[PDB]
Amino acid sequence: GSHMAALEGYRKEQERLGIPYDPIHWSTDQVLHWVVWVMKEFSMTDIDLTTLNISGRELCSLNQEDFFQRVPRGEILWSHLELLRKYVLAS
């Protein structure tokens, strides 16, 4: 996507905290800083946090399916996530 709304939202939250743009380098907290913050912008709220309580290498290494079983309603998350790792030239 080319939507800066979600991007500037979380990226303004990332550079201020050191949070990596690319999902694989996230630490367990930042993995869910993303899930909490980004569940906020689209008023998701009830997406499985405790099921994604892993590090970035775990998050980025699982296919959409492994996520969609843990939590199927997080399509919008991944969408912004593509845009994250795309729109930094990968951190």
In the chain the domains, ranked by start, together with CATH numbers, are 1-91 (1.10.150.50)
The Cβ-side half-sphere exposure at 91, using a 13 Å CA radius, reads 18
DSSP 22: S
Q: Which residues contact 85 (CB under 8 A, 6 or more apart)?
A: 21, 22, 23, 91
Alpha carbon distance 83, 76 (integer Å):
11
Method of structure determination: NMR
Sole residue written with tokens 């080319």? 2
SS3 (DSSP) at 58: helix
Tokens of 24: 């694989």
| DSSP state letters, 28-64 | HHHHHHHHHHHHHHTT---S-SGGG-S-HHHHHHS-H
**What distances in angstroms separate CA 13 from CA 4, 32, 34, 51, 72, one per listed residue?**
13, 13, 9, 23, 25
The total of other beta-carbon atoms located within 10 Å of residue 87's CB is 16
Give the tokens for residue 52: 């994604």
How many whole angstroms separate alpha carbon 68 and alpha carbon 30? 20
